[PDB]
Design a protein around this ligand. Structure first.
Ligand SMILES: CCOC(=O)Nc1cc(-c2ccc(C)c(NS(C)(=O)=O)c2)nn2c(C)nnc12
Length: 108
């Protein structure tokens, strides 16, 4: 669809080298074990990241743009909920969410 195609283009931009400096922590699920975030899955009950969004998009699991945006917004919401406010990953999430919300708002 026209809307889902636009979302795919947003997702491809978020995964592009343009934004790599701050998008890379969202490229794949938080590895709470390697990172030793022993409380991560107690605090975050529905983990989300960009590779999962991409898997669902490629498999055409999102019926509409709102479902796609719900997943992306959960990824960011998880990041703000879990981390200390001054963590570098929070500053990175702020920049990538700016990019995402600005593109999403201009969906034809
Ligand atoms: C108080 C300590 O807080 C944290 O370390 N927080 C977070 C850390 C990282 C993070 C760092 C380094 C690396 C190498 C990775 N890679 S991976 C395979 O997990 O995605 C991720 N992502 N992250 C995301 C999203 N949301 N929070 C965090």
């Amino acid at each position: 669809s026209e809307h889902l195609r636009y979302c795919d283009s947003i997702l491809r931009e978020m995964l592009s080298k343009k934004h790599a400096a701050y998008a890379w922590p969202f490229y794949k699920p938080v590895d709470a074990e390697a990172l030793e975030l022993h409380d991560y899955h107690d605090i975050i009950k529905h983990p989300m990241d960009l590779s999962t969004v991409k898997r669902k998009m490629d498999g055409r699991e999102y019926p509409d743009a709102q479902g796609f945006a719900a997943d992306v917004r959960l990824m960011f919401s998880n990041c703000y909920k879990y981390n200390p406010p001054d963590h570098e990953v929070v500053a990175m999430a702020r920049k990538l969410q700016d990019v995402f919300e600005m593109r999403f708002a201009k969906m034809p």
